[PDB]
Structure formats: structure tokens, C-alpha cells
Amino acid sequence: KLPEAYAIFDPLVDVLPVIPVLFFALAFVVQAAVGF
Amino acid sequence: RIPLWIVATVAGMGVIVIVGLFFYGAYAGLGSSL
């Protein structure tokens, strides 16, 4: 429940928090592409 | 031929997506308590 005019975005608001984590994740993807 | 990392991440997400499914599945899944 965000202000009425934002109704459209509950979907994203929903995900935004996962991102932080996502970074430690990516950090690996790159390290892998760069053969350690 | 196909870059090695590219197979890892897509192989990984699957484990992270499939596993993720499993956690949802425990909330509505038969094994929920409703």
C-alpha cells in the first residue's frame, strides 16, 4: 500500500530490495569471466 | 567453444529459480498449514 497514484508499481516496489544481494552475486559473474 | 562463465550463470539461475520455486511452493504448497 503506497500512495494511490502509485498503484501501478506495487510490482517493482516488491522487488527493489532483492538488489543489494544481487551485487555480491554479480561480483562473481565478472570474476568468472575474468578467469580469477 | 561456448564461453564457460555463460554456461555457469544460466545453469546457476536455474538452481536459484528452481530452488526459489520450492520456497514459494512451501507457502501455498500442500505443505503449508491452510
Binding site: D10, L12, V15, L22, L26, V29, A33 | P3, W5
Partner: peptide, 28 residues
């Protein structure tokens, strides 16, 4: 409802930078 599709894109946003970087060059 939709929430899932829109999460998808952001998630594959990061490995895409790795890809767009593979092709072009730099970083190294």
C-alpha cells in the same frame, strides 16, 4: 500480479553488462 516479469529484466540486467563488455573490450 505482474511483479515477476518486471523482476526478470532487472535480474538479467547485470550479466548483460558483462556480455556487452565481453564483445566490446576493456575492463582488462
Amino acid at each position: 500480479i505482474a511483479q515477476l516479469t518486471m523482476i526478470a529484466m532487472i535480474g538479467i540486467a547485470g550479466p548483460m553488462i558483462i556480455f556487452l563488455l565481453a564483445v566490446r573490450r576493456g575492463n582488462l
